[PDB]
Design a protein around this ligand. Structure first.
Ligand SMILES: [Zn+2]
Lengths: 153, 259
């Protein structure tokens, strides 16, 4: 049963020495404070070292008897990406990592003339989920997103 | 409040309609049956559910998966215990599927797997490079190392892929290491001639029948006993060779490196 500090400056505890995923921590943070994982900056209190990626958790922090700091990167500066369609046509879009996949789909549905729920998107082999933000998928300037028709069978 | 917190723990972050849709699907699919064919369970055809037969029979082949959403894992458990109604309604609900409406098995399959994790090891290593920006290796672990949407053969998976780099120049990435317990590749319906004189490298696949611009039909195929088994929504037949439009292809454990 940990705890995380912010700049509110208020705190709250992660109710879990369990599951343990940094990401679930993130998600725990995500659903506890409505903040997207990709904007979360974690650092062990007070050694500002900001963590490995592997498995929960220490390394350098474990048990109900420690604390970690959380700062939210509030950057959603616009960027240009590509969406390549059913026939292989890529068109540029202005986006923010903060917009949802669903929002980008509205754009694409706009420029392609296909109902937003009549197709779905992938990035580098992986499916993009509607409710999640573009930033979840490590989208970069000029990343290419693929449009797949929603078949009916 | 407490009640809202518990639903959040149970179903995770969902939209305001989710629980109503789930509970209605639960009631609506109550009559569906899972029937035993060649000693495995297949979803009996009903209300255009063939795409769910494909999805369900494919998931049943995926060893060591587990769902990170508790209601979904419980439903999954119940399904394995022979009571599939909850799991079916839940995946329809997470899939935004509508009862009696035809849908896309691959889109659903990978939507469902996005909520899952792998209870064993798996790893991809990709090499990316730009003439300007240089070289970086990208490591990927768990369930995500086991699925790919966009190609349907292992050689296409291992081929150099070209895209545009951050810097404006062209960028390349390519798989240089791969260890998995299985490998699911998915793509658009694609005509292949599948023969069993020589055992194919894959162990199962799904097939879309019909024109893709109209409402088609899904069949789930398994390679077994030197034959192709075709599970068509509750029934099964057997063939040696089959010219068909493949969608999802399931391969065995990968164990690959590139010098
Ligand atoms: Zn570059």
């Amino acid at each position: 049963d940990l705890t995380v500090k912010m700049l509110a400056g208020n705190e709250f505890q992660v109710s879990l020495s369990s599951s343990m995923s940094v990401s679930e921590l993130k998600a725990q943070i995500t659903q506890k404070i409505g903040v997207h994982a990709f904007q979360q900056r974690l650092a062990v209190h007070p050694s500002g070292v900001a963590l490995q990626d592997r498995v929960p958790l220490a390394s350098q922090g474990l048990g109900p008897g420690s604390t970690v700091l959380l700062v939210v990167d509030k950057s959603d500066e616009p960027l240009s990406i590509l969406v390549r369609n059913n026939k292989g046509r890529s068109s540029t879009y202005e986006v923010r990592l903060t917009q949802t996949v669903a929002h980008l789909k509205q754009q694409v549905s706009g420029l392609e003339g296909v109902q937003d729920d009549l197709f779905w998107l992938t990035f580098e082999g992986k499916p993009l989920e509607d409710q999640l933000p573009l930033g979840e998928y490590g989208l970069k300037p000029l990343s290419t997103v693929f449009m797949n028709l929603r078949l009916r069978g | 409040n407490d009640e809202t917190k518990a639903l959040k723990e149970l179903y995770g972050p969902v939209d305001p309609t989710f629980l109503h849709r789930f509970y209605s699907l639960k009631a609506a699919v109550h009559g569906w049956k899972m029937v035993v064919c060649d000693k495995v369970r297949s979803l009996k055809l009903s209300d255009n559910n063939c795409y769910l037969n494909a999805v369900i029979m494919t998931l049943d082949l995926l060893k060591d998966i587990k769902f990170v959403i508790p209601a979904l894992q419980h439903a999954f458990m119940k399904h394995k215990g022979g009571d599939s109604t909850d799991f079916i309604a839940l995946i329809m609900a997470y899939g935004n599927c509508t009862f009696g409406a035809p849908d896309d098995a691959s889109r659903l399959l990978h939507t469902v797997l996005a909520k899952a994790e792998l209870c064993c090891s798996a790893r991809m290593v990709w090499r990316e490079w730009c003439n300007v920006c240089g070289i970086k290796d990208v490591v990927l672990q768990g369930l995500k190392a086991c699925c790919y949407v966009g190609v349907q053969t292992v050689e296409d998976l291992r081929a150099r892929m070209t895209y545009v780099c951050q810097c404006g120049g062209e960028r390349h990435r390519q798989l240089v290491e791969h260890t998995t317990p299985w490998l699911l590749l998915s793509g658009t319906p694609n005509e292949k001639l599948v023969t069993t004189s020589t055992a194919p490298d894959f162990v199962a696949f799904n097939v879309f029948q019909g024109i893709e611009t109209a409402v088609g039909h899904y069949v789930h195929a398994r390679l077994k006993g030197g034959l192709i088994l075709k599970f068509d929504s509750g029934t099964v037949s057997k063939t040696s060779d089959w010219k068909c439009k493949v969608t999802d292809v399931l391969f065995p454990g990968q164990k690959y490196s590139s010098d």
